Amino acid sequence: QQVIIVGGGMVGLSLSLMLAKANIAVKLLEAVKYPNYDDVAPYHSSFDARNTALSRRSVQIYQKLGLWDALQQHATPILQVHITEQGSFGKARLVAEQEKVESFGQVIENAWLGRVLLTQVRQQPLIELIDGVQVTALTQDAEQVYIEAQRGDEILKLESKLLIAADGRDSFCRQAIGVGVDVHDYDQVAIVTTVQTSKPHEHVGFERFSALGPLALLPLPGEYRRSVVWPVKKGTEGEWLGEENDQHFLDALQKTYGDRAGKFEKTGKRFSYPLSQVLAHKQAVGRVILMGNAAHTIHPVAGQGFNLCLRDADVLLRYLVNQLSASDDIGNPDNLLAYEQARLSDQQRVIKFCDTVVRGFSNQNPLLKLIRNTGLIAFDV
Amino acid sequence: QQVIIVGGGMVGLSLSLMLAKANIAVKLLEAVKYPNYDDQNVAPYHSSFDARNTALSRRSVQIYQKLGLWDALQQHATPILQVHITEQGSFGKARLVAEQEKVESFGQVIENAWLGRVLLTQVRQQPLIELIDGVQVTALTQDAEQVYIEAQRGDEILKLESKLLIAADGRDSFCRQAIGVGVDVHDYDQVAIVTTVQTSKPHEHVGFERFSALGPLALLPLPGEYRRSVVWPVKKGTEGEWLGEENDQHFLDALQKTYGDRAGKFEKTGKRFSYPLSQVLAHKQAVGRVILMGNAAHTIHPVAGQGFNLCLRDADVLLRYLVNQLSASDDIGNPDNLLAYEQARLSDQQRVIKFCDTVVRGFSNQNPLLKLIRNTGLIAFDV
Numbered sequence A: 001q002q003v004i005i006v007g008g009g010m011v012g013l014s015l016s017l018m019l020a021k022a023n024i025a026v027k028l029l030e031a032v033k034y035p036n037y038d039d040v041a042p043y044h045s046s047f048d049a050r051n052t053a054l055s056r057r058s059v060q061i062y063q064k065l066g067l068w069d070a071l072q073q074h075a076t077p078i079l080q081v082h083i084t085e086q087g088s089f090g091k092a093r094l095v096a097e098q099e100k101v102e103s104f105g106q107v108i109e110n111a112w113l114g115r116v117l118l119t120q121v122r123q124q125p126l127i128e129l130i131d132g133v134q135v136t137a138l139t140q141d142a143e144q145v146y147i148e149a150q151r152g153d154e155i156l157k158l159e160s161k162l163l164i165a166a167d168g169r170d171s172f173c174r175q176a177i178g179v180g181v182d183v184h185d186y187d188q189v190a191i192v193t194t195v196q197t198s199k200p201h202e203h204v205g206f207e208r209f210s211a212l213g214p215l216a217l218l219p220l221p222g223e224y225r226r227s228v229v230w231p232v233k234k235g236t237e238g239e240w241l242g243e244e245n246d247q248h249f250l251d252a253l254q255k256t257y258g259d260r261a262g263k264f265e266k267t268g269k270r271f272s273y274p275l276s277q278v279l280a281h282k283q284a285v286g287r288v289i290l291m292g293n294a295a296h297t298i299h300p301v302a303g304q305g306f307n308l309c310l311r312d313a314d315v316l317l318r319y320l321v322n323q324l325s326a327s328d329d330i331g332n333p334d335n336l337l338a339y340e341q342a343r344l345s346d347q348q349r350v351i352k353f354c355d356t357v358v359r360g361f362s363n364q365n366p367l368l369k370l371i372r373n374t375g376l377i378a379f380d381v
Numbered sequence B: 001q002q003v004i005i006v007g008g009g010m011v012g013l014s015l016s017l018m019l020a021k022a023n024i025a026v027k028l029l030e031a032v033k034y035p036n037y038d039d040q041n042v043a044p045y046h047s048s049f050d051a052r053n054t055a056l057s058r059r060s061v062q063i064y065q066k067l068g069l070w071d072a073l074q075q076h077a078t079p080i081l082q083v084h085i086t087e088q089g090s091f092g093k094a095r096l097v098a099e100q101e102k103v104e105s106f107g108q109v110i111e112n113a114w115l116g117r118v119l120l121t122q123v124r125q126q127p128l129i130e131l132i133d134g135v136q137v138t139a140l141t142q143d144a145e146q147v148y149i150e151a152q153r154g155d156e157i158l159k160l161e162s163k164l165l166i167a168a169d170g171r172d173s174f175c176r177q178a179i180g181v182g183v184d185v186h187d188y189d190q191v192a193i194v195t196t197v198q199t200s201k202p203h204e205h206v207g208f209e210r211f212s213a214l215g216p217l218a219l220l221p222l223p224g225e226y227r228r229s230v231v232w233p234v235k236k237g238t239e240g241e242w243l244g245e246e247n248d249q250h251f252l253d254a255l256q257k258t259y260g261d262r263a264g265k266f267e268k269t270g271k272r273f274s275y276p277l278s279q280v281l282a283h284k285q286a287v288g289r290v291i292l293m294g295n296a297a298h299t300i301h302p303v304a305g306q307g308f309n310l311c312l313r314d315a316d317v318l319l320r321y322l323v324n325q326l327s328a329s330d331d332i333g334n335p336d337n338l339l340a341y342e343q344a345r346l347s348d349q350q351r352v353i354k355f356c357d358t359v360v361r362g363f364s365n366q367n368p369l370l371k372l373i374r375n376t377g378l379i380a381f382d383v
């Protein structure tokens, strides 16, 4: 092979497929052992399964890869958004209609996204899948990267002209190349789950600004299934978590939305992850490049930062293919530095956008602050 | 009498009525001669298409309610019950509809001619208000005890004294220049084109605003069910293609092209007034026994109401300082009491001025509804 990718997640699996499509062989390393579904294995969307909001560029990226036709089987589009409020300024409704395909994006089930990616990777002869290995050494010289993976008793020694590190927020390769991270924490915790409503969503996403905070209702592939996103202050998560508070969670959703979504009949397990940002100081060190959560972990945004990672993968694929037009060295360090410079503006804009979204959770009645900020009618403050 | 208000506009008339309600006699001066309405059938009241309007806040209506005047003022004042903001963009189409919860919260749009008529009529029936019209103040001096002014009627020279002088004589206030107070001017490179239009569809107390390349185009209701006020900020230098009788059809075509059929056909437009968006601030608002009120203290244009709602709040707070001062002294124009009032108003005026900058800077913001849909983290976008 020519390229080594450390980390076999959504980003790593997607990056290996883009390289294989560009006729670039790749060794993919992953710590966990993948399920070998060999007759066969029936996919069923679980109430406790996680979801991901894909942007239009992410859908287009998978379209060029020829994978969206399969990914669409368990992904639904968002056609409209309905935003409402009822505070000390009046009731207001914001309805936005989509007209271009996937402008509001698609909500895909995570289990289906990884299954399609894993199945297609195993069909590509240019991708050598090496699961059950944990990298424990990484060195560099002027010509190659050297890694030592551990497989129980065996030692695995590999080398390549370029190493792509996509091993998650707690990346091992990032600390091996001596790169620190900056951590920004927020006093918020996102409560996500999957509920079942008597009324179908009809590809409409909902959000209600209440005293409990912004309560989201995203459509799911199931016509009567919805994905809830509910950020709250740290410590307030215990009131809604656990099987003991299943109906209490449904009661808060019912009294907030009333009958706009019908009756909240069932709910799954409520997941909680603190809102924070883990940003690496650098992304390119010699012939090693950080991709995904190894470079930046931005969870509070829609898509959990996955759309930004897919853009990094698409752009890196171009910088490597264009480099191969000039020489046989796909791991040209100056090319990796130029790639990082080309991604700086988009990454900083998303990182700043994440700060705006989290600080916006405190803003109740934002539709009527927009009405006031027009200066058209006379409020009194 | 005892208090002299210089300026017989909407502010001076309101202030004189507020002082009269508090049992405070007041002399009111004005440069223009007022038309005694009486029995002259030649001149009743008409809602002219070239007349100005004012958006009154809830507290402003509450102030006129305490004065027993809103029952008559409502005859030519309409409430805003809904606000519809539309927007079209590359990503799609969005609409925001905001309704009213409590009465008067969205405000009332009153005709300026009717407001001045009711105020002037009520002032003339108030014995505690001495109305002196056709007088122009040509001199203003002051000592430790009184203010001295000299007004001219052409041949008659009027000399008046008072313990307190309330200067409400407009943006080019003579009293502000007499006490030696300069102004600070903050200018924007935009002017606002306002006018009154008539539409085939009734507005039904619904105010509209559409964002486009022309800038934010506002359509607000008026007392006439088919009358609407247009608020249109443009860049300085391009207001000529909309002003003038020869551009009446050019102006109506731009309204029809922006709103389509949401307001029916734009049948008729009045004269287009173009006033520059700017803030004129007096360096000081109180010097001795002279105090500035209205546009004499701060001319505020970009916001709805043209600062009038701020002036009524200024007058309401001023009455509280004057009434309490009279409860402990006979000097209603104590300079230190006026200075304590000015500092207490600094917070309100400064936040209105900052709100003006926020409004003006928002004109350059096209597609604001989509930005709100983006800034909530609901769906995945990319810019």
Ligand SMILES: [Cl-]
Residues within 6 Å of the ligand: B303, B304, B305, B306, B307, B308, B309, B310, B311
């Ligand atoms: Cl105002």
